[PDB]
Structure 1
Amino acid sequence: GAMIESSTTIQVISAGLPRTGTKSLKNALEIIYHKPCYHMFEIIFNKQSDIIKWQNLIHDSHMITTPPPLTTKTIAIYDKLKELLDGYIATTDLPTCGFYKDLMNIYPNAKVLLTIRDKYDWLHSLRKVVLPKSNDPWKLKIEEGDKVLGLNSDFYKLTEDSLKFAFQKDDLNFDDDQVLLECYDEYNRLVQETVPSDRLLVLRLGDGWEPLCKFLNVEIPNGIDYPCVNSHHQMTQLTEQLIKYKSLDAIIHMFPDL
């Protein structure tokens, strides 16, 4: 296909929850658009200063009225969200995914994705990487590796509060598997009820390039396989290597996705 000059603005909003292929999708969208895609890893590696800003936004988010019409309070919140996303061509992952409705309003020419997978595979992945149960010994290892990266209690608070926001819960028993499974199913159902079908592509792990590229009117990247990264097995190795070497820079050459 011909090469065309793409605008550096949000063109793709992925509502998919963490551990549904968001990092592979981030990589895929950066391969297509050659500009950055938001993801929690963007906060960890490039924008830790953004943590307080997302926390502030979530704290105020209850004041949004879904437009149209646009209220004064909503405009003020939307401006802060636009600022956070300046320079990016897409959003994935926490903390953005719960804002998909608001991002659709801010970026009316953006298209919407939803990544989904088997609910029990999702929970298992979530418990291995993001939210281990309180009494799980692996939680202490995760926390020890995270400190190497400069991640503290505010990072965990952002994960919790952005998951609460996505699930529209005032509080959440994070150790309750049944609650998380029910929230997962309700969240994915509500996305599909909310986004006009013409504007939504539902992706399942394994779908690869073709449905995505068709939806985005781009050629399939030539000779590049669809990304397959961020497995919980690989995250466990990362945590263990951070613990062992006590720096990211000492080991990053061993993790080509970082």
Structure 2
Amino acid sequence: GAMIESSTTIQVISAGLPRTGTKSLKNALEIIYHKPCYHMFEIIFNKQSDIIKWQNLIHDSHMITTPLTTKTIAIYDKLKELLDGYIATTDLPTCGFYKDLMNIYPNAKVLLTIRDKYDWLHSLRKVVLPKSNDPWKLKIEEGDKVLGLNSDFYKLTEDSLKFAFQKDDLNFDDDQVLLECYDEYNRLVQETVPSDRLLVLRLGDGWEPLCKFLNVEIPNGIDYPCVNSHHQMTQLTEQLIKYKSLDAIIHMFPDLI
């Protein structure tokens, strides 16, 4: 196809929860658009200084009104500022703001990444939210310290998930609670977003439906990304602990990071 000059603004809002292929999707959008896509990894590796800013936004987000009041404009401006220079959003903490992002970026299209709820839960427990008594939790915390992630990071991740599920009293150790929130969250996205503006991507769907939805060619000779498996994250955590730095090992994780 012909090459056209794309605007550096949010063009794709992905409402999918972590462990549904968000990092692969982030990489896929960057291959298409040649500009950055937001993700929790963007905070971890490039934008740790914005942790407090995401926290402040969540703190004020209860004051959002779905016309537009004056308090919502202030919140919307901080969201737009946080995303300046990016062409898409995926993952926490952005995903729970999908409805507000649709208002801020009226010409952006919306994606929902989904998968089997039990596969999701098991992936979540291995990587990002182990049960409190799971010994692997202590390894995650040790690797996090190597990356410079402290208590404010843990607050932001939890608070952003509570915001996405619209539930402050969240028993993170309760599998049935989490599964119920996952199903209700995905149902609400599909009920909320007009179907002309939504594409639901199940894990493994690949380039095709995404590229058709976005009116772009499939990137020639590039396989759709497959990164961030729970096995690969376990290796990343163990390698961070072993070497005590990211830069000692980053060349071993060329696409994940």
TM-score norm. by structure 2 comes to 0.99
Deviations 1:5-39 (A, max 9, x none): 00000000000000000000000000000000000
Q: 1:132 aligns with which of 130, 133, 139?
A: 130
Deviations 1:41-93 (A, max 9, x none): 00000000000000000000000000xx1100000000000000000000000
How big is the shift at 1:112?
0.1
SS of aligned partner of 1:128: helix
Q: 1:223 aligns with which of 221, 227, 243?
A: 221
Partners of 1:11 and 1:103 in 2: CA distance: 10
Partners of 2:152 and 2:131 in 1: CA distance: 18
Partners of 2:158 and 2:94 in 1: CA distance: 13
Identity of aligned residues (%): 100
Partners of 2:56 and 2:252 in 1: CA distance: 35
How big is the shift at 1:171?
2.1
SS of aligned partner of 2:13: strand
Residues 113-132 of structure 1 aligned to structure 2 (within 5 Å): 113-132=111-130
Partners of 1:183 and 1:235 in 2: CA distance: 24
Question: What root-mean-square deviation, in Å, do the aligned CA atoms of Structure 1 and Structure 2 show?
Answer: 0.5
How big is the shift at 1:153?
1.1
SS of aligned partner of 2:19: coil
Deviations 1:173-198 (A, max 9, x none): 10000000000000000000000000
4+ runs deviating over 2 angstroms = none
Counterpart residue number, 1:155? 153
How big is the shift at 1:231?
0.1
How big is the shift at 1:155?
0.7
Partners of 1:162 and 1:199 in 2: CA distance: 24
Partners of 1:91 and 1:103 in 2: CA distance: 9
Counterpart residue number, 1:195? 193
Q: Which moved more, 1:166-175 or 1:30-39?
A: 166-175
Partners of 2:221 and 2:251 in 1: CA distance: 23
Partners of 2:169 and 2:246 in 1: CA distance: 33
Unpaired runs of 5+ in structure 2? none
Deviations 1:109-161 (A, max 9, x none): 00000000000000000001100010000000000000000001111111100
Q: 2:98 aligns with which of 88, 97, 100?
A: 100
Partners of 2:220 and 2:58 in 1: CA distance: 40
Counterpart residue number, 1:8? 8
Partners of 1:199 and 1:70 in 2: CA distance: 21
How big is the shift at 1:257?
1.7
Counterpart residue number, 2:208? 210
Partners of 2:96 and 2:169 in 1: CA distance: 15
Partners of 2:82 and 2:189 in 1: CA distance: 23
SS of aligned partner of 1:147: helix
Deviations 1:226-248 (A, max 9, x none): 00000000000000000000000
Counterpart residue number, 1:239? 237
Deviations 1:205-243 (A, max 9, x none): 110000000000000000000000000000000000000
In the alignment of these two chains, the number of paired residues is 256
Partners of 1:26 and 1:217 in 2: CA distance: 18
How big is the shift at 1:170?
1.9
SS of aligned partner of 1:201: strand
Counterpart residue number, 2:65? 65
TM-score norm. by structure 1 comes to 0.99
